[PDB]
Nucleic acid binder design. Structure first.
Ligand SMILES: [Mn+2]
Length: 664
RNA sequence: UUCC
């Protein structure tokens, strides 16, 4: 299957990915880096008192609150779905090495017995119907840009004025670039408009990962995370090795003189990709309108906000199945990319725009530093984009691509195993569209609520119900994958978008409730993914702008957890043992300081008005903008708060851009 | 130095 071409940083093809400015040049050369994160102002993640705190808190909570998950993966009782040892990592120090991204996932999919295209005409009609329902009758809106985000290849600018110019210039020259691409002139498109080149691979921390305590040895064991070396990555797995990264932290003592307590490990690192902003801008200009459409018209299956918002839907079901998808982004099929482009062309979308979109899902990737003495290599040839990495995280519409794939995959699962009587409803495009439009509004006996690779599938009373139970049973047995498209299983400890579905003795959706995940509160408060970046003066540009504000939304977010009170008290007690101070007081102080500092960023609130007008979501997002990247959408945040985190491009300009893209 |  052809190895992918690879070029060292020194090669002209890689050099061309970095503009002649210090930032870009430094991004190209950055070597492996690690170090303790500043968990909170003045507190490092490896501070002896903090690790002592984590040791005691994790053992105590695990021992006193064992998981309550039944044989079908439904959590009940204490609402706990696992041990609490996940907090035992030296945050800021990664597992070595991180993985090289797979240049082609075709073999990976084939070996996993996944299909290389819609397996039946019905499936082909549904995937295409999804494209028609999602990309039709879109309303333009201004292109919003995250403050402080990098434009990556080739400029690596973080300056909002520069980003706005890049975005406006891109919406203006997109057509010309796309047509150049239609002519096979990728180098031209890239050199003239910076549309193309590659994704810049950045390795991010998944701060908490599974750890178990071996009753026999009394030693802790970290979950092995398999990583691919360069050979494996460029040959799509045909050669090279797939092996377990080392999470052993002993090295930190010898290397940095850091004391490492027993049972503390290095963090799991995941690949993330920064897209070339000039190419992403014209894609984002279409993506937001699509989100606005599916979150409004198809709100039932796609717009999720609070625990109660989700609860109201699942309540009406007779059966709720919490699914789980294995490695969604790397398994995502390039044929769906081509199917989507093809259908957009049929709907009348501008060819040059579709070309831009298709190319963004075939782009080469530049690998920075997976480990010491490794990296700085471009995978793929920018002159002719042909990678099959699956779904690139920094592409302008990754969320939509995952949602489109999975939503139809789940529907097909329901049709295949429970509702054959609904197949006659899907005879052609018009009927497929009508059926999908109704299914997505929650009007059929089979339903779902989903977002990318997270979802809950439902069956009301009816003919499909009996099949629903058979499907659930098949998932429990876990011997046969219920889908030809992705590896699907049931989630151990069913949850949807952060909220655990707590069942009572009846184990039925009608008497079940969504509660926050208490473990996530712990991950967020004691294992953040980033330090506080106290050296970045503009807080709005930090990964964690106002960390202290989360204390004010805690009760609203986790109050419904059965053991909420208990955890807060175990924390207070353990923090006292470790620091000789009150954690609560410590947090109230951080809350006060950040509340005072927030007024400096929000025109709305007076030079000291409280948080009175802000919602729980507003607060969680100010403390962790990332949640606006996987949990909520712009519309869920008060407008004056959204302005703090994002800046937009003129409405007139995106409006003019959209008009030229969409169907006449 | 990404992406509702
Ligand atoms: Mn789930």
């Amino acid at each position: 299957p052809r190895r992918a071409p690879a070029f060292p940083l020194s090669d002209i093809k890689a050099q061309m990915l970095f503009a002649n400015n210090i930032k870009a040049q430094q991004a190209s050369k950055r070597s492996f880096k690690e170090g303790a994160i500043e968990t909170y102002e003045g507190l490092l993640s490896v501070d002896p008192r903090f690790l002592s705190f984590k040791n005691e808190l994790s053992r105590y909570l695990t021992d006193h609150f064992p998981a309550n998950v039944d044989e079908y993966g439904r959590v009940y009782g204490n609402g706990v779905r696992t041990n609490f040892f996940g907090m035992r990592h030296m945050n800021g120090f990664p597992m070595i090495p991180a993985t090289w991204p797979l240049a082609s996932n075709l073999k990976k999919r084939a070996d996993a017995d996944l299909a290389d295209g819609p397996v039946s005409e019905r499936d082909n009609l549904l995937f295409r119907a999804a494209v028609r329902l999602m990309f039709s009758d879109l309303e333009p809106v201004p292109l919003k840009i995250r403050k402080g985000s990098s434009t990556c290849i080739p400029y690596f600018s973080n300056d909002m004025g520069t980003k706005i110019e890049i975005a406006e210039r891109a919406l203006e020259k997109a057509e010309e670039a796309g047509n150049l691409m239609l002519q096979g002139k990728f180098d031209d498109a890239y050199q003239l408009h910076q549309m193309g080149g590659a994704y810049y691979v950045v390795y991010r921390a998944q701060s908490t990962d599974a750890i178990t305590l071996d009753p026999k040895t009394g030693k802790f064991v970290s979950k092995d995370r398999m990583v691919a070396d360069f050979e494996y990555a460029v040959t799509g797995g045909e050669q090279g090795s797939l092996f377990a990264a080392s999470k052993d932290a002993s090295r930190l003592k010898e290397q940095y003189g850091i004391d490492v307590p027993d049972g503390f490990f290095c963090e799991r690192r995941r690949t993330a990709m920064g897209g070339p902003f000039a190419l992403n801008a014209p894609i984002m200009a279409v993506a937001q309108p699509v989100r606005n459409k599916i979150y409004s018209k198809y709100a039932y299956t796609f717009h999720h906000t609070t625990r109660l918002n989700k609860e109201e839907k699942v309540k009406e079901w007779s059966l709720c199945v919490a699914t789980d998808v294995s490695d969604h982004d790397t398994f995502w099929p390039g044929w769906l990319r081509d199917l989507i482009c093809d259908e957009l062309l049929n709907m009348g979308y501008a060819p040059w725009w579709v070309k831009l979109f298709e190319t963004s899902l075939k782009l080469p990737v530049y690998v920075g530093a997976p480990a010491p003495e490794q990296g700085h290599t471009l995978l793929g040839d920018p002159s002719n984009p042909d990678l099959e990495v699956g779904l690139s995280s920094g592409q302008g519409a990754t969320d939509l691509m995952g949602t489109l794939l999975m939503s139809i995959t789940y529907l097909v699962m329901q049709l295949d195993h429970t509702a054959p009587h609904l197949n006659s409803r899907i005879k052609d495009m018009p009927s497929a569209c009508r059926f999908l439009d109704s299914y997505w509004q929650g009007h059929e006996e089979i339903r779902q609520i989903s977002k990318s690779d997270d979802a809950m599938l439902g069956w009301t009373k009816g003919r499909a119900l009996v099949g629903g139970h058979r499907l659930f049973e098949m998932l429990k047995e876990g011997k046969v994958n219920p889908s030809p498209y992705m590896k699907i299983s049931y989630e151990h400890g069913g949850a949807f978008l952060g909220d655990i579905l707590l069942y009572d003795s009846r184990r039925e959706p009608g008497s079940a409730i969504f509660v926050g995940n208490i473990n996530s509160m712990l991950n967020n408060q004691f294992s953040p993914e980033y330090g506080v970046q106290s050296g970045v003066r503009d807080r709005s540009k930090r990964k964690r702008p106002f960390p202290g504000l989360a204390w004010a939304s805690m009760k609203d977010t986790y109050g419904a957890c059965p053991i909420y009170s208990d955890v807060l008290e175990a924390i207070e007690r353990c923090w006292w043992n470790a620091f000789g101070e009150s954690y609560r007081a410590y947090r109230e102080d951080m809350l006060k300081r950040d509340t005072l500092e927030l007024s400096r960023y929000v025109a709305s609130m007076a030079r000291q008005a409280g948080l009175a007008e802000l919602t729980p979501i507003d607060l969680e997002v100010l403390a962790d903008p990332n949640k606006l990247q996987y949990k909520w959408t712009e519309a869920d945040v008060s407008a004056n708060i959204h302005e703090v985190l994002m800046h937009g491009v003129s409405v007139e300009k995106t409006e003019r851009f959209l008009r030229s893209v969409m169907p006449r």
